[PDB]
Amino acid sequence: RPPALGFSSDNIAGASPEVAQALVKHSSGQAGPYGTDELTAQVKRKFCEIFERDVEVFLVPTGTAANALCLSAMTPPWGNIYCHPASHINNDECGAPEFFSNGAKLMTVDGPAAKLDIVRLRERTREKVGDVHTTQPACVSITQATEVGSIYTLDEIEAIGDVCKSSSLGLHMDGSRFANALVSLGCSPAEMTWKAGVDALSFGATKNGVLAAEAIVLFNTSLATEMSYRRKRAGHLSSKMRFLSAQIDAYLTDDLWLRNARKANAAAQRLAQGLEGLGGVEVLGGTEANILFCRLDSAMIDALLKAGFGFYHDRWGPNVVRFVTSFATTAEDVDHLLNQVRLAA
Amino acid sequence: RPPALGFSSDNIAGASPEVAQALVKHSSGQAGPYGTDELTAQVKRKFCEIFERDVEVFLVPTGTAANALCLSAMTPPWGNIYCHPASHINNDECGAPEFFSNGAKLMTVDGPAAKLDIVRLRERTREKVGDVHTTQPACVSITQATEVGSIYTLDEIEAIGDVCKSSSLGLHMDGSRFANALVSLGCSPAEMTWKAGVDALSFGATKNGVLAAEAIVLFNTSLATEMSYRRKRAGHLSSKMRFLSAQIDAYLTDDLWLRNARKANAAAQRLAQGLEGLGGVEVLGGTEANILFCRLDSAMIDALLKAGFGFYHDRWGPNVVRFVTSFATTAEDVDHLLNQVRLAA
Amino acid sequence: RPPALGFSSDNIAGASPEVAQALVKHSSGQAGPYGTDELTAQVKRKFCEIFERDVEVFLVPTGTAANALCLSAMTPPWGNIYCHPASHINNDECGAPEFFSNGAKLMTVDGPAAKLDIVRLRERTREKVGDVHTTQPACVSITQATEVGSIYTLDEIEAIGDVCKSSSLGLHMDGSRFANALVSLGCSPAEMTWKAGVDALSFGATKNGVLAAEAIVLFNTSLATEMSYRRKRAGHLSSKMRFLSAQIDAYLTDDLWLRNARKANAAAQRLAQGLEGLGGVEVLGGTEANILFCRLDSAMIDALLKAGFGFYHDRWGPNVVRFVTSFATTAEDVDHLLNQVRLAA
Amino acid sequence: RPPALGFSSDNIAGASPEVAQALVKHSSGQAGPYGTDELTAQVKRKFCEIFERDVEVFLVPTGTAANALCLSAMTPPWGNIYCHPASHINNDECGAPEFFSNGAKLMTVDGPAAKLDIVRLRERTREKVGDVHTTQPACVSITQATEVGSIYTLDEIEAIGDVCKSSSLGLHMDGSRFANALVSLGCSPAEMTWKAGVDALSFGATKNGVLAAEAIVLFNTSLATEMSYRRKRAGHLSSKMRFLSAQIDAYLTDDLWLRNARKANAAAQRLAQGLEGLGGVEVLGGTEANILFCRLDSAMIDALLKAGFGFYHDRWGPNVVRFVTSFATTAEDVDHLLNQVRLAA
Ligand SMILES: *Cc1c(COP(=O)(O)O)cnc(C)c1O
Ligand SMILES: *Cc1c(COP(=O)(O)O)cnc(C)c1O
Ligand SMILES: *Cc1c(COP(=O)(O)O)cnc(C)c1O
Ligand SMILES: *Cc1c(COP(=O)(O)O)cnc(C)c1O
Ligand SMILES: [Zn+2]
Ligand SMILES: [Zn+2]
Numbered sequence A, B, C, D: 001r002p003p004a005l006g007f008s009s010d011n012i013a014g015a016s017p018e019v020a021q022a023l024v025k026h027s028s029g030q031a032g033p034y035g036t037d038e039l040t041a042q043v044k045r046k047f048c049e050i051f052e053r054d055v056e057v058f059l060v061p062t063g064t065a066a067n068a069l070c071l072s073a074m075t076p077p078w079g080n081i082y083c084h085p086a087s088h089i090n091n092d093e094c095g096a097p098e099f100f101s102n103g104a105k106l107m108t109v110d111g112p113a114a115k116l117d118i119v120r121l122r123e124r125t126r127e128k129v130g131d132v133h134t135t136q137p138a139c140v141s142i143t144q145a146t147e148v149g150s151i152y153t154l155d156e157i158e159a160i161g162d163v164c165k166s167s168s169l170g171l172h173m174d175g176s177r178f179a180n181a182l183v184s185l186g187c188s189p190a191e192m193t194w195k196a197g198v199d200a201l202s203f204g205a206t207k208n209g210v211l212a213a214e215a216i217v218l219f220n221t222s223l224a225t226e227m228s229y230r231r232k233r234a235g236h237l238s239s240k241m242r243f244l245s246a247q248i249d250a251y252l253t254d255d256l257w258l259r260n261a262r263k264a265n266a267a268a269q270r271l272a273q274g275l276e277g278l279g280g281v282e283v284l285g286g287t288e289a290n291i292l293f294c295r296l297d298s299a300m301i302d303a304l305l306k307a308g309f310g311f312y313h314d315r316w317g318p319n320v321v322r323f324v325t326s327f328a329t330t331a332e333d334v335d336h337l338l339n340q341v342r343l344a345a
């Protein structure tokens, strides 16, 4: 197979062969609609096992929907949703959170590496509490792993959870790349979520191997009923649910999801180790997951561009490039990029 | 294969083997996200060919989303969406139209067989026009084929189109079962849509053979831009679009969609012909598509229920039963039901 | 003074001289804004006395705002607001309820004389309860006195309250013409509201004597906090609240409001007694409040129209006219209309 | 009269005696409702004269409503409303703009003295234009005079207008204190609005002398129709409009509004001139309107507080106090404050 030249995002990758085959297997026969079938029930039982707790699960088509739905059930229209200014909900959902929540307001809390600064968060969540002329603190959202591939430690997450419980705020986790942060920390799903104070999680699978299926995992099960209506009302209740369930079931079979995440993180780590010490190349950050950033010589950026590589190079500081690897990124794919970088140095 | 005992709805069926296999074929390699890939472009070209016109296409996860999105772009918040009181948008979307349109109001216009009465429609669309204290006529929605399996004729559709153009109202078609009405009429997609005045269509495929992929087909292309944002904002813009595109492409290959619709309609027609003249059985309607209604003796309803058949029997008048067939309903499946009806008579 | 020829509605009348003078008295000095002044506190204490209970009060600019705000706090976006099809919320608020509630859906329940039929209400409020694809029963709204001048008896109101408590539904009262129904029944404010099960009331004063000031009276005080934010968010929290408070205080001084209502009802009753037995004139209904309907000979309608009288005559059945009297309608004003009717018969 | 000790805001003042008397005069007789009366027509003609142009006028109860309504007609739900982070729409309307616009997003553009920095504005309004995943630039809002009493010059306003026309963005002016900036500049209403590119103005009168009546002045008259429905739908269409019209008519009679603004600005200017050179007192800014800020010795702040003065002293930097004067602030009121400041120094 020729080397895959795309490193723009993990969203360009396909799906593990086991996922597509699960769809084939489940394409025959009849099945109750809207999640009333056995496969769906099986998947829900799997989430309970995986999270070591009775949790409520709602499979939806996209991560944007998962996020907006979660947040809409955790804030009134006159409420505030605290998040990092570089978060996906504040930048790439065309205001989906604002839509689903019926006008809630996002309040940004800056911090290095796309992580909310705990001190600032503590200050913002106590602004004008009770003042009738001001929108009110309602919930907090943190992306795990972050939009730049950094990772909140178990201590940092739990710390945010303190502030949330302290001000009666809900805590949501945008886990579009949940698995990548999970395998980097080597902790349990439970330790990185409810045991740390998370109330709702956007369990991402699409970016880590499936076709199109995300899971809303509710730890604060009292929101289940509201969530059902909100999902349906937003047009996110799939009639032939087995086709979302089949994807996730495969995803959660034989530890496929974790293996896929390990391969993605392993690929970026390989890239960082190969880029360290090359002419006109400075790796930025620790490359904790499947996303790597590095400062490159412009001429080397054009050489990579001319070489047919797909990557972003204008969204941040001058000369800062971003390479994103996926579950399907082979060691070979990475070695091709390294070689082209070397040869272009 | 044993006989399929479910006739509750076509939404219990799986997917044509060609669809799942298309997903397998397209699960490898990389592809631009959010519909920027070649397969998606191919599918769009196919819609233009099929409809004999440059049309704008937006693939979405569900029919509820397709409907709500279409209607939201055709009415202001203070506008009215005219529809039959038995329509899906007025009953089974938990108010999705109201949600997406930011509060538009559904105005029902009754009529036999789930078809809007043209005279009543003409009267309702001219109520308080221009009155500041009243919501205003904005658009009209007709389900083709209807929720009860009846079909609007080309003349009836076009007639509704006159009223719409007359009052500057948009005309939307809920084509959840588009194909079933199309093959029953034997007309062209164009003749049953834009040539008759339709501005926006919810092109249904899920119920006729795919896993989960519907298509918003815009004939009034001036709404394209607004539709992009609305789709994204509602969380309905799938990142790995090839998995929706692959389904639809297969659906629109070798006339699969039409063949599937023919088989579904053929199955119901077989059932109606077998039920005609049996004890305690009166077939209601002409069974124009893949949905059949009949009045049955209660005892025969329990015998079918005890026989393990799945069907609705309480949603309408007393003793009125509904059997729905799908693209996968075999002549054998139908003959089993007929036999059980006979034996239970 | 010449006779007042307008009988279109009570909304054409001005304000009792005591109201305007209260504004004069309170136009000097300084006062805390947004209802934090003494006059406002005084008014709130008056509502508690008048209703013989601790109630929460929120003065707002219009009856449409009072209605929408009340209902928005009693129903989720996916909820249903039951009301008569001829109700103001379903006809003349350009969808304000739909707006404030973020998309809730009005469900009409017909009945003679603009009064919800209890049997139908009982059936509608138990439709698809718990069904995820359907909007849910949330609250009920009854207009007291109704839009046609009829009145719900204490028994009828309480009966609706049973259904509401039975299905955990909130009960709102549109009291745009609260006082007119109150003095017709001769009951206490408490007996016609909370003692009968009402949770929220749109206490109308504008139509009965003030310039522009309505009062949201909450008996279910647990909604107070939410109501504050909703009122502010909707732009209905007046900064110089004393100018709404001054109007209402005057309104509730020396039983002015009741006296005003008595005069309005007395005027319509005088008109009905004078119209009974005249050529080409049939009085319809019992004229329980300040609104009278009668069937008149077309030629007599033009004679009244040519005589300069203002009234509606096309909104109902053929030849059905509506005369509405106000707190300022003198016996003289009524005698002029009667004379012109006589002379035109 | 004893000295008025309140300087918290101009919203604590009452109304010019001419306003209350206008209400008295107009409290008798009958009048068409919802702005269909002669007084209202008269007022509209006055706005056209005052602005030297045919403009559309919509009188509403509050400034928050005026703002939200204006902005809702200038941005789609997926649009951006650019404003200063210290603006009223971004801080004290409990998200009214977000509510009325159905979820539009406020994008802050910082700058000294509550004035949007033109360079930053130019950069922000061209972010992700056309990108489907991002909310889009839609309109800009500037407060004239600003929330801190500063004033945009005719050149600064027009400059913002260039950017707006350049990117097809609407330009709204929050003129809560319109008159104060107008008399400080000595320009014409037209020069400070449409001649500089303003499309919609929240014409503030309440803070400058009336009881409760603001005016939405539309220079982009093509939005009139939409505005009517939006106003009604939001519950802001007063039935007895003459009571808003009477206030504004008085306000715009014998140059009362301008005289009132001159007195307010004159009072603050007197205060600044008296505070200049006193112990432990530093005046901040040029005091261009009716709002003054100064840094005071804590002990002097308690002495003023103990003296019974009402003012804010915690909302900004340490030791920064704010005194706001109104149309009713006499030279005497100001001399009392100066004396107490002196004696407390
Ligand atoms: C990719 C991503 C999402 C989801 O995007 P969709 O295209 O809506 O599925 C959400 N959050 C983050 C941080 C992401 O990287
Ligand atoms: C099945 C159906 C739909 C779509 O329902 P989803 O479950 O949202 O895909 C829409 N309209 C009609 C008439 C239908 O029968
Ligand atoms: C007059 C009236 C209202 C209020 O109308 P506004 O013009 O918004 O104050 C509300 N309900 C009923 C039944 C009315 O008659
Ligand atoms: C006072 C003010 C308003 C209006 O407030 P309301 O209480 O809603 O009338 C709006 N903008 C600014 C800048 C203000 O100072
Ligand atoms: Zn902790
Ligand atoms: Zn025709």
Ligand SMILES: [Zn+2]
Residues within 6 Å of the ligand: C158, C159, C162
């Ligand atoms: Zn009872």
Ligand SMILES: [Zn+2]
Residues within 6 Å of the ligand: D158, D159, D162
């Ligand atoms: Zn310029």
